[PDB]
Design a protein around this ligand. Structure first.
Ligand SMILES: Cc1ccc(-n2nc(C(C)(C)C)cc2NC(=O)Nc2cccc(Nc3ccnc4ccc([N+](=O)[O-])cc34)c2)cc1
Ligand SMILES: CCCCCCCCO[C@@H]1O[C@H](CO)[C@@H](O)[C@H](O)[C@H]1O
Length: 339
């Protein structure tokens, strides 16, 4: 039946969780939610418990809540966050006002690793391999992460990496594809490969590749490496004023990456070239990057799985808060823990 719950206040926040979850201490807080570390007595594992903030107080919050539960319930991959539990104190839908999501506790992110050691090439290989493996899986479900950066990549003592979203309220713009910042209205998956490129570069050199101070600086820093748009790419911009603006800048040539990333594995350099192309249609995909000779030690085409079909049709619906709430509630109730 239903577990026995208990109540406590942590930081002017009520946490009402099943008894199984003990030793709650706050680790993160913000507009989106708050998180406590906890011990799961049933399994012996340390867990993160995320309580959504105001999950049904607005239409946008209500859809986000549903969006996040659905996505997390779907992700079943070693290199992506998985859901251990989801629960509510509510005994009925008419009572339903709070949602808590439980996953493995992940205390260290890739950002921590990159500050605190200079990585071997085998170390870069393993980490980048695992990011592309999770992304291949995420991209197969027609999900775009949009915010890949070191602080959204958990890494454990054993160097095993999981993609998630740690955010609850390392500038995002440093890792962002040039078209996101251009407000290109219809961008795609390949934006995530730009980010992987930036993270891989930083793993090789130990420093941010493009530490822009704003969006304009960001773009300048990008063009110094990859060059001003060519003829073919200028064609894919139908705006004349954009083209004339770009043509009126000091033209930057493309740098040879092998000349920039000095002393990196030539294979890593070649892979980087394929990731950090301005024209997103030319970027290497996650599935393709996995088969690149840089990962010969890791690649197994038979252990790089794709997602089950993911029904995302809700994204295009405009619904009432209590419709989003009832749907979220169906998802809480139907949840089956992993073994
Ligand atoms: C509205 C929305 C929709 C989806 C997501 N989302 N998306 C994804 C992808 C599948 C694409 C990677 C993942 C997420 N959400 C997500 O990761 N949520 C999510 C769910 C439970 C716990 C957490 N945080 C944490 C997990 C594990 N150790 C942690 C340790 C510390 C902290 N800390 O100090 O703040 C947070 C932790 C994140 C996030 C927000
Ligand atoms: C100021 C420097 C110019 C940067 C140009 C970025 C080119 C982005 O690449 C573009 O992304 C679009 C969005 O998916 C695609 O539809 C286009 O096919 C692709 O060329």
């Amino acid at each position: 039946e239903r577990p026995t719950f208990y109540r406590q206040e942590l930081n002017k926040t009520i946490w009402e969780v099943p008894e199984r979850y003990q030793n709650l201490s706050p680790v993160g807080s913000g507009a989106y939610g708050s998180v406590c570390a906890a011990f799961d007595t049933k399994t012996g594992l340390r867990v993160a418990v995320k309580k959504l903030s105001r999950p049904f107080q607005s239409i946008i919050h209500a859809k986000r809540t549903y969006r996040e539960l659905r996505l997390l319930k779907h992700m079943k991959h070693e290199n992506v966050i998985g859901l251990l539990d989801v629960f509510t104190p509510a005994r009925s839908l008419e009572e339903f006002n709070d949602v808590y999501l439980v996953t493995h506790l992940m205390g260290a992110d890739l950002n921590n690793i990159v500050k605190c050691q200079k990585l071997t090439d085998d170390h870069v290989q393993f980490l980048i391999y695992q990011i592309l493996r999770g992304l291949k899986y995420i991209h197969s479900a027609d999900i775009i992460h949009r915010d890949l950066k070191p602080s959204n990549l958990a890494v454990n003592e054993d160097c095993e990496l999981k993609i998630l979203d740690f955010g609850l309220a390392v500038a995002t713009r440093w890792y962002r594809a040039p078209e996101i910042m251009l407000n290109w209205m219809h961008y795609n998956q390949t934006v995530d490969i730009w980010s992987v490129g930036c993270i891989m570069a930083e793993l090789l050199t130990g420093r941010t590749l493009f530490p822009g101070t704003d969006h304009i600086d960001q773009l300048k820093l990008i063009l110094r490496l990859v060059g001003t748009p060519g003829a073919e790419l200028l064609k894919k911009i139908s705006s004349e004023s954009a083209r004339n603006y770009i043509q009126s800048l000091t033209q930057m040539p493309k740098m040879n990456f092998a000349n920039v990333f000095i002393g990196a594995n030539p294979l890593a350099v070649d892979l980087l070239e394929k990731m950090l192309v301005l024209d997103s249609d030319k970027r290497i995909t996650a599935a393709q990057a996995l088969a690149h000779a840089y990962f010969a030690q890791y690649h197994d085409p038979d252990d790089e799985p794709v997602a089950d079909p993911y029904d995302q049709s809700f994204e295009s619906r405009d619904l009432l808060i209590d419709e989003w709430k009832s749907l979220t509630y169906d998802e809480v109730i139907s949840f089956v823990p992993p073994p």
